Coordinates of C-alpha atoms in Angstrom, one line a residue:
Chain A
X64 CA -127.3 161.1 248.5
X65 CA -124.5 160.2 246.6
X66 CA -125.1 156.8 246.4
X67 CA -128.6 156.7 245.2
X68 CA -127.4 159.5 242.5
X69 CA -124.8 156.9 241.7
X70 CA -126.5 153.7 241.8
X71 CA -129.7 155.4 239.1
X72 CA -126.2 156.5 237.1
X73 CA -125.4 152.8 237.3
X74 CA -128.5 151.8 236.2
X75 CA -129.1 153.6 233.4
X76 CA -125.3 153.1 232.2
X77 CA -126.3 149.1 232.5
X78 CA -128.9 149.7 229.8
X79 CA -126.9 152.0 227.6
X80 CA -124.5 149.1 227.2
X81 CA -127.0 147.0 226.6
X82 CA -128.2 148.9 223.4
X83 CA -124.2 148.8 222.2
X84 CA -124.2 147.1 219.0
X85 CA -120.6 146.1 217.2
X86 CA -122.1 145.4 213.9
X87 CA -123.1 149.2 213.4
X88 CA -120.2 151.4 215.3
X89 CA -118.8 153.3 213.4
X90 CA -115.4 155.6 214.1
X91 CA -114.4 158.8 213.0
X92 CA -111.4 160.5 213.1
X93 CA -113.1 163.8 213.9
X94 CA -112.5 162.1 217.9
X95 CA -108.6 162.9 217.6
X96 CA -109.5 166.2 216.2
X97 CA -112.5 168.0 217.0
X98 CA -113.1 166.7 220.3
X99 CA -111.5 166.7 223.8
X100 CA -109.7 163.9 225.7
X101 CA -111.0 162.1 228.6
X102 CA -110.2 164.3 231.8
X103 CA -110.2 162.3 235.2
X104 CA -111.1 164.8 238.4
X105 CA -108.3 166.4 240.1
X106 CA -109.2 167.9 242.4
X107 CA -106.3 168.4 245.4
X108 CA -107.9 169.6 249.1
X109 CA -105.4 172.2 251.1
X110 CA -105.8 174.8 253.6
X111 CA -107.5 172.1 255.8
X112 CA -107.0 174.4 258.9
X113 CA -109.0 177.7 257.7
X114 CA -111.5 179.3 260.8
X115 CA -114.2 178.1 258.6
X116 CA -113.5 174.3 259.0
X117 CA -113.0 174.9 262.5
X118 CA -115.3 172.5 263.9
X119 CA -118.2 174.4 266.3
X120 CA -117.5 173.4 269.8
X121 CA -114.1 174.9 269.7
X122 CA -115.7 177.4 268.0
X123 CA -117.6 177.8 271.2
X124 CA -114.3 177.6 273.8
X125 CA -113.2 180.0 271.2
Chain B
X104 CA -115.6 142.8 218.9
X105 CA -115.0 146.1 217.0
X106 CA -111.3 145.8 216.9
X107 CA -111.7 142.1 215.4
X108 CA -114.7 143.5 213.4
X109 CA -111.9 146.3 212.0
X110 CA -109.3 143.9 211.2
X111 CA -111.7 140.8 210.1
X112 CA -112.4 143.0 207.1
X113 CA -107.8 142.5 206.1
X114 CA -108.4 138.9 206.4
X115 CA -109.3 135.6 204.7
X116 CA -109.3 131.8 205.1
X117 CA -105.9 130.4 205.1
X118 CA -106.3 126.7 203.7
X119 CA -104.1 124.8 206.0
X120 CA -104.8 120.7 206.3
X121 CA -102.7 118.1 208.1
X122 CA -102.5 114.2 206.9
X123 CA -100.1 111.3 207.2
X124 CA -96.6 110.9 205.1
X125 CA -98.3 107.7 203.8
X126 CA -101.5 106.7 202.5
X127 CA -101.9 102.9 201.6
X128 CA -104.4 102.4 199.1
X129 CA -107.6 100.7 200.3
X130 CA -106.8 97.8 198.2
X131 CA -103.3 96.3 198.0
X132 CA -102.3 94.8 194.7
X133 CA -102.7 91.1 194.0
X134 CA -99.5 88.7 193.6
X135 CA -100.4 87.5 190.3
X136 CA -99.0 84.0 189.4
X137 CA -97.5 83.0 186.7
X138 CA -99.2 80.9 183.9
X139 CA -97.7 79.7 180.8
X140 CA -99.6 80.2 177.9
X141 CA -98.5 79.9 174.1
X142 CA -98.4 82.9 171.8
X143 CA -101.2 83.2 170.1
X144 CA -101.5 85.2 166.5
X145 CA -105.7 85.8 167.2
X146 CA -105.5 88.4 169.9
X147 CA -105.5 91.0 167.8
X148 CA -108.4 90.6 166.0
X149 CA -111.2 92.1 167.8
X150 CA -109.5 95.3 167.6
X151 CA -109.9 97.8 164.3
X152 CA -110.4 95.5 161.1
X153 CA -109.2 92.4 161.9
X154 CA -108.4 88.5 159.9
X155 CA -109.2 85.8 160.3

């Protein structure tokens, strides 16, 4: 699943860079002050050892 | 290609050439011999009013 949601998120990336143009792009400042930074995932697993990730044939012994 | 784009716009043509210390000319001059030849009072006569 993920990779085919990916790989269409590829494609369609491969074409917006396509339509990039140098000559026009323009900057604003508004960038530094109206809008957010960049945020990268971080997302931290813990509690790996709940009764919910217990896996079902202990489950069963259980 | 936008950051050169955005600092193109501060620049210009800087005029720089390179050559040699010394150029001859394409011609050197002519050792010209010496001839002796009398004075002569008519050279002058072709230029302005002149007598004859």
């Amino acid at each position: 699943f993920r990779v085919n949601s990916l790989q269409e998120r590829v494609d369609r990336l491969s074409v917006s860079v396509t339509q990039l143009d140098p000559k026009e792009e323009e900057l604003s400042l508004q960038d530094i002050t109206m809008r957010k930074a960049f945020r990268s995932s971080t997302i931290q697993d813990q509690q790996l050892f709940d009764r919910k990730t217990l896996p079902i044939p202990l489950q069963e012994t259980y | 290609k936008v950051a050169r784009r955005e600092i193109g716009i501060l620049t210009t043509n800087k005029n720089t050439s390179r050559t040699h210390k010394i150029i001859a000319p394409a011609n050197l001059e002519r050792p010209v011999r010496y001839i002796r030849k009398p004075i002569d009072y008519t050279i002058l006569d072709d230029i302005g009013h002149g007598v004859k």
